[PDB]
Design a protein around this ligand. Structure first.
Ligand SMILES: [Br-]
Ligand SMILES: [Br-]
Ligand SMILES: [Zn+2]
Length: 120
């Protein structure tokens, strides 16, 4: 799966209204009473995933194991992506040995896992 970064996910003050997984029954505001990205337990290990089709997706708040070049991170899906994953720059640096800006995008193995792995 293709993984890139988006510094929007590094902004702790960003309202969850600005990502797909806001309100509605499946939204993270509704389920966890978070109102910003910075309130998510393991922020900034968050991002968008194709599994999240948009608002009220049942895939909101799913946890994903991403593997690349010997590294493993776990990220919470909080937003839509057209394909693959877009994650915080900090998270992509962890995944790529600090080479995120240089690489831009990488091919990673992705696996859905229990949310305890994302600190929930
Ligand atoms: Br490394
Ligand atoms: Br290492
Ligand atoms: Zn390494």
């Amino acid at each position: 799966d293709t993984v890139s970064y988006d510094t929007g996910y590094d902004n702790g003050s960003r309202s969850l209204n600005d990502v797909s997984c806001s309100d509605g029954p499946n939204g993270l505001e509704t389920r966890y009473h978070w109102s910003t990205q910075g309130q998510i337990p393991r922020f900034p290990y968050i991002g968008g995933a194709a599994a999240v089709a948009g608002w009220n997706s049942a895939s909101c708040g799913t946890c994903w194991k991403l593997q690349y070049s010997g590294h493993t991170i776990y990220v919470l899906a909080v937003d839509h992506a057209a394909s693959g994953f877009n994650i915080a720059l900090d998270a992509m640096n962890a995944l790529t040995g600090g080479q995120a800006v240089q690489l831009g995008r990488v091919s990673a193995t992705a696996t859905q896992v229990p949310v305890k792995n994302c600190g929930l």
